């Protein structure tokens, strides 16, 4: 039958209706007063967490990040940068907020590696994401048959090289066919036209 | 000006590098110190 999990999930399908609506209105007040990276004992969205790879083990950390909202905060132009080149309040950046989050998080934890992240709400001027990080040095995880992969030296700073799932989903790598000619196998490998 | 202990050791070394190529090297090599620094004409770091 339905798993208790499928309930948490089925609820966040519309974080603005019912109990969850009352929760967020409350939590946020507390959230809005927390740092920019708060570690938390348990994931707010359990289904999602586990689903994304979470495990109630040793070395599996969760942290809620809070990034300022908006689009782009771009200066005008020092020298003589023409019209098509005067970006300031009408353009946005090529990296989505969740990626910014994942990064700030991994920095706060200079030894942990990003596993994944999820949204947990957003008031009128900031977005919150919980990021699942992992200690590649705790044997507790070095042994785990489902997570020991995140230990390869070539997984170091995996988030800063866009290896997160959201990382890849942003580098235009979702589709295996049409419209991904300039993305895969690498944006840089494609003279950045993706 | 006041010189520190290091600033001194250095100035010391620098003064020493200012010696001539010992007579014997001339012979042992059958034939010039390209680093002769004069207190007036040249200039040391710091």
């Amino acid at each position: 039958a339905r798993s208790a999990y499928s309930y948490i999930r089925d609820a966040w399908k519309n974080p603005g209706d019912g109990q969850l609506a009352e929760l967020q209105w409350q939590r946020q007040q507390e959230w809005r007063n927390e740092g920019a990276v708060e570690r938390i004992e348990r994931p707010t969205r359990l289904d999602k967490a586990r689903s994304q790879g979470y495990k109630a083990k040793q070395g599996v950390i969760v942290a809620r990040v809070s990034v300022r909202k908006g689009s782009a905060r771009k200066r005008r132009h020092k020298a003589g940068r023409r019209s098509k080149r005067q970006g300031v309040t009408r353009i946005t950046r090529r990296k989505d907020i969740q990626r910014v989050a994942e990064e700030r998080a991994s920095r706060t934890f200079p030894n942990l590696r990003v596993l994944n992240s999820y949204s947990v709400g957003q008031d009128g001027r900031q977005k919150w994401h919980e990021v699942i990080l992992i200690d590649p040095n705790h044997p507790a995880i070095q042994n785990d048959d489902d997570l020991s992969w995140i230990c390869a030296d070539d997984q170091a700073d995996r988030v800063f090289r866009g290896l997160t799932g959201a990382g890849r989903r942003n580098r235009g790598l979702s589709g295996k066919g049409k419209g991904s000619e300039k993305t895969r196998p690498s944006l840089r490998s494609n003279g950045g036209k993706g | 000006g006041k010189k520190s202990k290091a600033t001194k050791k250095r100035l010391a070394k620098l003064d020493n590098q200012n010696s001539r190529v010992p007579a014997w090297v001339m012979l042992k090599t059958d034939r010039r110190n390209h680093k002769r620094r004069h207190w007036r004409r040249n200039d040391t770091d710091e």
Binding site: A1, Y5, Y7, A11, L46 | -
Partner: protein, 119 residues
Amino acid sequence: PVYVDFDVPADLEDDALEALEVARDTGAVKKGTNETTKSIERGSAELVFVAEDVQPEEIVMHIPELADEKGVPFIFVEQQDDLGHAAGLEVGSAAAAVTDAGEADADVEDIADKVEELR
């Protein structure tokens, strides 16, 4: 808190937890929010326990309404780890279920009643 709609008197809770310990040592019980859930869905639940000190509240939010559309009676427990120890576990639990009591059916019966009276 958001899933709680009535406070269960210190005394009443005690009884509930007391009954639970003999429930494991007689009939049967489910330990864990997930196990508790299915039981309510399968109907094989007579009395379900839900901790009040849970966070994220997500985990349990559903219980109160799912048990109401399944008749199954339920009771709140101020603290999480007590329910865990009351179900005989090293690490506290957020929700437990009394799957067919045992030499407690008399109590359960009343407790379930005592709460109905508690609105």
